[PDB]
Write a protein that binds this DNA or RNA. Structure first.
Ligand SMILES: [Zn+2]
Ligand SMILES: [Zn+2]
Ligand SMILES: [Zn+2]
Ligand SMILES: [Zn+2]
Ligand SMILES: [Zn+2]
Ligand SMILES: [Zn+2]
Lengths: 90, 94
DNA sequence: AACCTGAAAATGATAGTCTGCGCGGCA
DNA sequence: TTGCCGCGCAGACTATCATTTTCAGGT
DNA sequence: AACCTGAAAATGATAGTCTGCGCGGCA
DNA sequence: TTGCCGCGCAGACTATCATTTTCAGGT
């Protein structure tokens, strides 16, 4: 496997990529750049950037059947629907 | 909560003791010493020493139902019983 | 009331971890 | 031709925290 | 064969992390 | 007495590596 050389970490990952992404956390390195005009945000991991890029699309992917609002994560949508339900109850 | 001030660490623990024990990693400190004649081993955490002290005690805690041998960790005993099972099965197939 | 005010909830963005896939390399 | 393995990839989750919006209390 | 010999397995010790408990301090 | 909150401990775990013992290979 692959272990972290950091002073007191002692973490282990089963892939080189995972170790490099973990180590970028100690070195505050964010290889994955948003190629979007005006953003210049950077991220440790490719998933983080794949998700960030949705903030720029005019129409966000996940939709609310009720209020037509749109969202990015599933968790965003579920939290929003639980707010709708808690609101109905009141 | 409790965060590590060390550069680029970014660990977090929910108790002072936990933070202090992590910080023993940076300072290479082993506060908890074995008070046993001739041992003089040292440890980062109190649990590590609580576990070590069993090596000196006359009766180890975990026992084997089969061969009566005794052990320290549960993992030790689980592994030993799986050795018993592998051997019993292999000779039973034979 | 029509106010404010800070608390409470919603919303938004982003960090780590886990699963399962395909794809090349190896034997 | 094989599968067998190491590996990166893509997407999911939870958790965290900041930023906004709502909300209730007192005034 | 009964050898050795190195591989594989057993065994032992020790690092970090997670959960649940009781325990004291308060308000 | 309520709990509510911090807090350290104990038990449990995973994982790693060192040290011993077992076990087949060729001889
Ligand atoms: Zn690390
Ligand atoms: Zn961007
Ligand atoms: Zn909605
Ligand atoms: Zn640290
Ligand atoms: Zn000792
Ligand atoms: Zn036994």
């Amino acid at each position: 496997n692959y272990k972290c050389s950091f002073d007191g970490c002692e973490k282990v990952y089963n892939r080189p990529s995972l170790l490099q992404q973990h180590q970028n956390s100690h070195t505050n390195q964010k290889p994955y750049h948003c190629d979007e005009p005006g953003c210049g945000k950077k991220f440790i991991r490719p998933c983080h950037l794949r998700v960030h890029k949705w903030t720029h699309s005019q129409i966000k992917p996940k939709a609310c059947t009720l209020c037509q609002k749109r969202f990015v994560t599933n968790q965003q949508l579920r939290r929003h629907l639980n707010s709708h339900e808690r609101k109905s109850k009141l």
